[PDB]
Amino acid sequence: QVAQANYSKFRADYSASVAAFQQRIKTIEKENTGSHTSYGEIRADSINNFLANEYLRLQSHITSRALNILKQAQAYETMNQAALLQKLIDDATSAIDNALKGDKKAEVLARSLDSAIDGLSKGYMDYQNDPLLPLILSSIEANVKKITTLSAQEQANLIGLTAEQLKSIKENDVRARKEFLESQPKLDNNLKNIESVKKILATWG
Amino acid sequence: NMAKAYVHDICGYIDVANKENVRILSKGDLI
Amino acid sequence: TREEEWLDKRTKSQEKVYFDQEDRKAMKRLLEKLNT
Amino acid sequence: QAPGNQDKILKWISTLSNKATTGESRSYCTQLSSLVSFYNKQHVEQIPTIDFNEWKSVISTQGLVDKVKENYESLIKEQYNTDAISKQISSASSKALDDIENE
Amino acid sequence: LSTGEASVVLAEKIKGITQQNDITEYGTVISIGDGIARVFGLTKVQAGEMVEFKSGIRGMALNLETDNVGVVVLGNDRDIKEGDVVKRTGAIVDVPIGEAMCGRVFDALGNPIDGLGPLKTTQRARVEIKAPGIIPRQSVRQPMQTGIKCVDSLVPIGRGQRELIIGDRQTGKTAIAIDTILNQKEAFNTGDVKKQLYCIYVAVGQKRSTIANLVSILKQHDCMKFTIVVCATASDAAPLQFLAPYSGCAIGEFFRDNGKHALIIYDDLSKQAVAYRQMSLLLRRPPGREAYPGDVFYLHSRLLERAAKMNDSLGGGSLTALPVIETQAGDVSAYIPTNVISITDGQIFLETELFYKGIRPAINVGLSVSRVGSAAQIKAMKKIAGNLKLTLATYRELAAFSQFGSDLDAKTQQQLNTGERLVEMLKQNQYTPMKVEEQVCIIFAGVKGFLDALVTSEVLKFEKKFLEHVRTNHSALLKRIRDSGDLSEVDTNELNTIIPLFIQEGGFKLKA
Amino acid sequence: SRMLDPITIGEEHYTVARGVQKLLQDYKSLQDIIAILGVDDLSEEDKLVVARARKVQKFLSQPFFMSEVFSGIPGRFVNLKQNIASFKALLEGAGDEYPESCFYMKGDLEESLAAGRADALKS
Ligand SMILES: Nc1ncnc2c1ncn2[C@@H]1O[C@H](COP(=O)(O)OP(=O)(O)OP(=O)(O)O)[C@@H](O)[C@H]1O
C-alpha cells in the first residue's frame, strides 16, 4: 500500500513543479509594463524520487522495528516458559536425591528387594512396582496442580516479563531510532567541506 | 564553474527527508 | 627447486609470442587473398 | 516509477561532465554526480505485511500486541508533504545560482 | 499451548518411562594393553558391537577369534585390569541425531563437551550403514557457495559432490572451510529454506585450543546456530579419531534423508588413517605399505561415498563433503593422498609458494578441477568463468618470458597486465566471505578489461568501494542477479556503464 | 605463527612481515637459475629484488648475549617498534645504496647505516 502513497505523492510533486511555467508569466507581465534549461526538471524529479524512495525506506524501518520488537518478545517468553519447566524438572531430580537419603527410605529398599526377586524369578526385570516413579509423580503432580489455576494468572505466570526484560526491548527501539536518525550520508569526504554541508551534518540529529 | 553553483544549490536542499523523519519518528514511540 | 618447470614456462611463452605474430600475418594474408 | 524515470537525469549530467576539462571542473562534476545518485537511490526491500492477529493469537503479553499495533498504525499515517517542499524549491533557490544563470 | 497444558503433557511423558533389563552375556579380559583388550568368552557377540566395562567406558568388538575377542577401548584404559568384566550391550555403535545438535560440540560418540546441558534428542542412527544405491541418487545441479571468489568461479562445488581440500601445513586449508560456514549464515537469517546448508565440522587429531578458538570465531559471527562440531582430539583414543568422521556423516544423513542439505567438513583424514593404522597394528593385523592396513582405501571410500544428492522421491536432500588432506612436502604422490584423490570428484590444491608470494587463498588453478563443472554454477557465473579461465592460462604462460626476455609487446603487455589484475582480484582476506552476486560484479569488471586501467595495488580497495556503492545505489540489480541467478543483457549494459564511470570518479591510481 | 594476523598485531606489522616473506620467496624462486648462470641476463626489477633480498636476509641475523663468546661481539636487543621501522625502511629502499656487509650482525637499521656510512667515508 505504501507504493500507492508513493505514486500519489510522486504526482503531487510533479504538479507543483509543473506550476513553474506560471513564474514565467509573471516575468512577462513585468516586462510588458516596462516602457541548463533542464536543471529545474532534473532537480525537481530527483527530489521527488528521493522523497518517494526515502518514504519507502522509512516504512521498511518502522515495520522492521515493529516486527523485531514482537519477535524479540516472543523469544523472551519462550525462554521464560522453558525456565519454569526446567525448575520443575530440577525439583523432581532433587526428590530422587532426597529419597536416596534417609527419612522413609526403608520401603524403597524393601520395595526394590520385592521387585528384584520378581525380576530374578523372571527372565527379565521391569520396575512395575518401584516407588521412585510414583514418588516423583506425586511431587510433579502437586506442582502441576499448583500451576493449573486459570488462564488469567497464566498470562503473567507463563510469561513473567521482568522490567529489565521489557527495558531491553525498549532500549533497542530507542537505539534503533537514534541509529536510523543519526545515520548520516556518506558522499565524497574531502569534497563536502562547504559550511552549509558541515552545518547540516553537525545538526543532522 | 557552473557546476560549482549547481552543487551548492542542490546541497542546500539536503536534510529535508531527515528532518521529516525526525518529526514523524519523534511523534510517537513504538514500544 | 624446479628447473624443469622453468624451461617449460620459457618454452611455452616464447612459442606463444612468435606464433601469435604468425597468426596475425596469416589472417591478413589470407584475407587479402580471399577478397580477390 | 522504478524503471526508466532516471535516464534523462543521466544525459544531463553526462553532457555537463563532458564540458568539464580542468581538474577542478572534473572534481566539481564528481561532487554533482554523487549528490544526484544519492537523491535518486532506489529502495526495494519488499516491506512485509504484519498479521497482528497471528501474533496476538499464537502468544503474547496481554495488551502488548494491541498497543504495538495501535502505535505502529498511528505512525504509518504520517507521510511526507511533497506539496510544501515542491513549492519552496520551485519558487526560489540559491539566488547566487540565479546570478550564474543571468549570464 | 497453555503453560499448565504443557506441564501436564510433560508430567504424563515422565509417567510413561519404560526400562527393561535382560540377561546380558559377559566375559573376562585375558589381557589389556595400549587400549586393546583381549576378552575371553563373550560369545554370541556381534562384530562391531559395543561392550561396556566396569568403570563404564565402552569398547568395540572388532576381532572375533576362536579363542578370544579383540576389543578397542573407547577412552582411557587405566582402570581396566585383568579379570575385569565386559558386558555386551547388544547394539552396534550409534549416535544421537536431530536438529538439537546444531550449536553444540560433541565427541565421536555423541556426548556433549560444551557444558551447556544434556542433549535433548530421541533419534539414534547407526554409524556404519550401506551407502545409497545408484537409483536414489540424482545429478548434482545446485551450487554450494563457499564465498571464495577463486573457488566459486574456477572450482565450483555442487551440493552432493565431494571436493578435496589438499595442501601442506599452514596453507589455508581450514580457512576455506570456515569461510564456507560463514557464507551460509545469510541464508539462515533470511527465510529461504531452499538454500539453508547445515555445516558439520569434524576435528580429528587437533589440539582442543584450536577448536575452542574456532568455536569462538563461529559464535562471534553468530554462525554457530547452524553448525555442529565433532571433536576427536590428539589426547582422545585412536578409535575415537577413527569413528568421528563416520559419526559426523551419520548426523549428516539425517538432514540428507529429510529433504535438507548438509555440509560435512572432515579435518585431516590423514590423521584418521594414522589412528586406524594404530588401532589395527595393536590388534596384530598384518601391515601394508607405510604400515597402513590393506583396506585403508575402503575406509575413506565407504565414508565419502555416503555423500550424495538424493532424488526428489526421497526428499531431494543432499550431503556435501569437504575432506581435508595434509601433504608432507607437496608430494601428492603419497599413498593416502593418492587414494583420496581417486575417490573424490575434484581437489583444491593449496601451494605454499603461492601463499607467501601474496596469493592468498593460495589456490593452484592449474591443478584444481571439479567434475560437476558449470552444472552447479549459476547462469550469471558460467558466462564469466569461461573467459576468466582462458585469461588465467594465458597469464601463466607469459610470466616466465617477461622476467628473462625483458621485452613486452603491446598485445602481450595488455594480456600480461590483465592477468595480473585478475590475480589481485581473486585475492581475499580471511573471515570475509563474499556474496555470489557481488562476485559476479567484481569478476565482471575484471574479465571485461576495466581493471586494466587502475594500478594493481588499488584493485582490492576498488572492490570494497565499488561493492558498497552497488549495495547502496544499485540494489535492484543485485536482487535480479540473486533471484533470477542470471545476468541479463540489460544488467550487462547497466553494469558495463557504471564500472568505468566509478573508476574515473573515485580517487584511484588510473595509470596502468 | 597463529599470532600473525592484522587484528591481533598492528596492520603495519602484518604488512611488513608479508612483504619480507614475499620478497624472500621471490628471491628463492630464482636461486636455481642464478646458480646455473649469473644475474646479468636477469631483469632489472629482478636484480633489484635479488640485491634487496640479500640485504634483508643478512639483516635478519643478530648477535646474542649468550653467543657473545663465540663471535666476540656484544649482543643486541631489538624493540618491536625499531624492528618494524628498520624493515619498513629497508623494503622502501633506504639502505639499498650501501653494501650488504654493513647489515651483518647488527641490532638496528641505524647501526648498519653508520657502519655503511663509515665505509663510504673511508674511501
Ligand atoms: N585469505 C587469507 N588471507 C590472509 N591470510 C590468510 C588467509 N587464509 C589463511 N591465512 C593465514 O593462514 C594461517 C592458517 O592457515 P590455515 O590454518 O587455515 O590452513 P591449515 O592447512 O589448516 O594449517 P594447519 O595444517 O596448521 O592446520 C593463518 O596464519 C592465516 O592468517
Ligand SMILES: [Mg+2]
Ligand atoms: Mg587446519
